[PDB]
Amino acid sequence: SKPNDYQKLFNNANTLKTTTPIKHVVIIFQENNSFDRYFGMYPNAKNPEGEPKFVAKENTPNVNGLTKQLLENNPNTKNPYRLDRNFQPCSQNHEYHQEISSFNGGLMNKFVEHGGCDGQVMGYYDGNTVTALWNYAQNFALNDNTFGTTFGPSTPGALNLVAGANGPAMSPSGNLENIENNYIIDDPNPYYDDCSYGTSKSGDTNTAVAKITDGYNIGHYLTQKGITWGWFQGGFKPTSYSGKTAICDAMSTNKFGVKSRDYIPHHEPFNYWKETSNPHHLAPSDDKYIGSNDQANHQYDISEFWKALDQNNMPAVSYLKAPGYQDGHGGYSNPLDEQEWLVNTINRIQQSKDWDSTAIIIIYDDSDGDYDHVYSPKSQFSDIKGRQGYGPRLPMLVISPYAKANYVDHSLLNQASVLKFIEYNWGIGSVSKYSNDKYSNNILNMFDFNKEQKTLKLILDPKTGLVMHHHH
Amino acid sequence: NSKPNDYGTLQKLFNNANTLKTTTPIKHVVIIFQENNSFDRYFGMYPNAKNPEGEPKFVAKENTPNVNGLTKQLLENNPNTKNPYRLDRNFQPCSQNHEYHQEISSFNGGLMNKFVEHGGHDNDTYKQNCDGQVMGYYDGNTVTALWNYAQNFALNDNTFGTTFGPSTPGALNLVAGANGPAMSPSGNLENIENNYIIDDPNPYYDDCSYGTSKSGDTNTAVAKITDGYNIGHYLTQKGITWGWFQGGFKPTSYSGKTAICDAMSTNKFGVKSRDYIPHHEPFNYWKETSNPHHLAPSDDKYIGSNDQANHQYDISEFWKALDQNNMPAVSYLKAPGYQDGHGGYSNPLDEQEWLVNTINRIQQSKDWDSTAIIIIYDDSDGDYDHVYSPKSQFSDIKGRQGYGPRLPMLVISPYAKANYVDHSLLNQASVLKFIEYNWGIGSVSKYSNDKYSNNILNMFDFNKEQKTLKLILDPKTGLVM
Ligand code: VO4
Ligand code: VO4
Structure with missing residues (x-):
């Protein structure tokens, strides 16, 4: 029901x-x-x-x-x-x-x-x-x-997209039906993400969390080489904060009347590695730094993609969710x-x-x-x-x-x-x-x-x- | 034919x-x-x-x-x-x-x-x-x-x-990645559609396709490739040693300048057949890469190189090349x-x-x-x-x-x-x-x-x-x- 120690x-x-x-x-x-x-x-x-x-x-x-x-x-x-x-x-x-x-x-x-x-x-x-x-x-x-x-x-899918591998991985809850032979086969939430936990409407007290324990993803290499990149996701921007801890309660109603969370934590692959994570959903230090290195660690609300694009700073590699x-x-x-x-x-x-x-x-x-x-x-x-x-x-x-x-x-x-x-x-x-x-x-x-x-x-x-236009 | x-x-x-x-x-x-x-x-x-x-x-x-x-x-x-x-x-x-x-x-x-x-x-x-x-x-x-x-x-x-x-589409696909464009003097019959070979017409440029050989058949149409190259074209141009080496390619006799490919063997169940199968020889579908009279290499030293054989060989020629330290760069064995x-x-x-x-x-x-x-x-x-x-x-x-x-x-x-x-x-x-x-x-x-x-x-x-x-x-x- 509350965020773990990072x-x-x-x-x-x-x-x-x-x-x-x-x-x-x-x-x-x-x-x-x-x-x-x-x-x-x-x-x-x-x-x-x-x-x-x-x-x-x-x-x-x-x-x-x-x-x-x-x-x-x-x-x-x-x-x-x-x-x-x-x-x-x-x-x-x-x-x-x-x-x-x-x-x-x-x-x-x-x-x-x-x-x-x-x-x-x-x-x-x-x-x-x-x-x-x-x-x-x-x-x-x-x-x-x-x-x-x-x-x-969806979690193996996201990990495979960015690493081509779905592990090795560990969970504080053990394997359950989430992990088999160290590889993630279901949808445990990412460890390094405030919004995985019960303090968020987008989180879940009864969903286990997992972290990748060996091997890099593409982000390691893009960051290292100085290649502008980001994961840009709807709902990533917190609706509020509760003492350091980000709360992601953004919701939308679809054409057919179903109201749902904007942010889905187990769709965020980079927050499964400690290195590539932004657990507090910190905003970019500035619009100018979108895609570069700062407190956001390349993990962004979808809004930040459009700011980068419109400001002639379109990243080399952008994931849009x-x-x-x-x-x-x-x-x-x-x-x-x-x-x-x-x-x-x-x-x-x-x-x-x-x-x-x-x-x-x-x-x-x-x-x-x-x-x-x-x-x-x-x-x-x-x-x-x-x-x-x-x-x-x-x-x-x-x-x-x-x-x-x-x-x-x-x-x-x-x-x-x-x-x-x-x-x-x-x-x-x-x-x-x-x-x-x-x-x-x-x-x-x-x-x-x-x-x-x-x-x-x-x-x-x-x-x-x-x-x-050029611009929206 | x-x-x-x-x-x-x-x-x-x-x-x-x-x-x-x-x-x-x-x-x-x-x-x-x-x-x-x-x-x-x-x-x-x-x-x-x-x-x-x-x-x-x-x-x-x-x-x-x-x-x-x-x-x-x-x-x-x-x-x-x-x-x-x-x-x-x-x-x-x-x-x-x-x-x-x-x-x-x-x-x-x-x-x-x-x-x-x-x-x-x-x-x-x-x-x-x-x-x-x-x-x-x-x-x-x-x-x-x-x-x-x-x-x-x-x-x-x-x-x-x-x-x-x-078989013929397979053999053409192996050496060219294409089964045409092709034409037959007999027209499509059930051999060709839209100038691509879909069944087993015999090669045009092969004496042993014809009824003069027991490997051949009077009632089987022949076909040739009319455009586009095979890998042999390029290997020859580049001076890379290569050949197609097939059992029964060595003629058993000649009638004038026509090769006769009548070699036969009996399998373990007593079934007798022609050693040579013309429609399995893809290079003979192109005039350029063919050896229609099944001519021998000018010399063992020339196996894989350019001469009258035009890189088409009896299987026996492979072993000679091998044993004499002249193994081809590219060899097809049939x-x-x-x-x-x-x-x-x-x-x-x-x-x-x-x-x-x-x-x-x-x-x-x-x-x-x-x-x-x-x-x-x-x-x-x-x-x-x-x-x-x-x-x-x-x-x-x-x-x-x-x-x-x-x-x-x-x-x-x-x-x-x-x-x-x-x-x-x-x-x-x-x-x-x-x-x-x-x-x-x-x-x-x-x-x-x-x-x-x-x-x-x-x-x-x-x-x-x-x-x-x-x-x-x-x-x-x-x-x-
Ligand atoms: O397609 V999912 O793993 O978010 O139910
Ligand atoms: O098309 V064949 O495998 O019968 O020579």
């Missing part, structure tokens, strides 16, 4: 030596959707009356999605079906062991049993609902062969609120003076446990207890003036491919002996650095996802 | 491969291109063998990695109308249907559940002699050598045919038919004899220290494999659907990780990618999948202090000698 200005990202023309990568880390749920039906939409109309461009390449056979004779006890945009989607079961059970040894036929609201595990959306996401694929690059580095929920209601997670979020966040954010970055050297990556943390038909290949760590993977397949997009347009990359990626790109582009090696970065393919087939004409900005209506 | 077509418009010693600049310690790659077995058929049950009395015994070593193979669920509750089942050592396996379209039909939109329906042949005949064999798998009591290679070297369980379909692994006319035991004798002999040579041997297959026979293969970048192009079925892939080398399963996504053009990477060549053509293919470097450890040991086996059993 200035240097960087050169502008634009001046840094990089392997590619990309000077700024922005990773928009959304929640809880399988590849098939979002793109299985791409690029075919129902187009009923009164919903945003989607019509695919001629010669849209195909995705490894939901075929006639998968739609009509699914091995599961219920067939895939089209989810309504007007209803609030539930959250399915994304526990490590449950997801493996759904996969059922390759049969991929126990999702109703182990992903179960019931039956929504089989639901998919099309372009009438995930309109923006589908329009982004129509104009930029999509990968249909990207997987969670391990099976399991929506306020809860917009992160795309079932139950408390949904595709319409997510789309507003996605469209507003991506519109704003494209309008900025740094769009010309930017790559935006949309990737997910976990599948919610939702149906996807692909029996994921093994990772090099799959024989190690607590590191089973690869996990379920996820949406992955690259939005950039250097992105291939209306292009589907079939290259085998995992969450540590994002890590691989950062390492490749800024000249950093493998983060640790635990990391999957060493085995991950890069994302370069989603880019064309040789073409003369740039891929143009795509400005959309945040309320519909349909095609519609 | 009873007689050879007209071939239309009618010497340089390369430096020793050991003197060449390379990216890695590998100065010699040997690609042993076997036939017609899916990953699951050969390795789905790895590393668990039945070990019935009298059959060559396999136990797995401590810490053998797991493969993406046949689980309890796939074994007991398979989506197909018949469950996977263990094939015996003791019978001549049939050949299943590895046609481009039939294989796609087995996959059945991702259900992977129509193999009995489409992996078989609708044939009297097949029904009475072969029923159910599409679902058969072997274990270490049959494919003993191959399982022991995996136990001592590197195996990849995520390697696929570049396209769906049979067994005489009876030992190529293909159902119907070959089998695991004849194949195993070929593999063991070949690999023993390379390991015993002076250049093993700088060699990597790759074992990879051309096609799956249409045999069961559970993996719904991911798409290639050419999958929306008619005649180029892929990736096709998953195949066995091994790397045997003093530099190979030992008892290691690489899960990297490979396809047949990954072999091409390795050659290009190692010897400093770019993509072969705008048509090639090489540019989208991962390399095989996760199967090597060039940094470890102790070299991977030789594995000398008994060709009769595949057991350690």
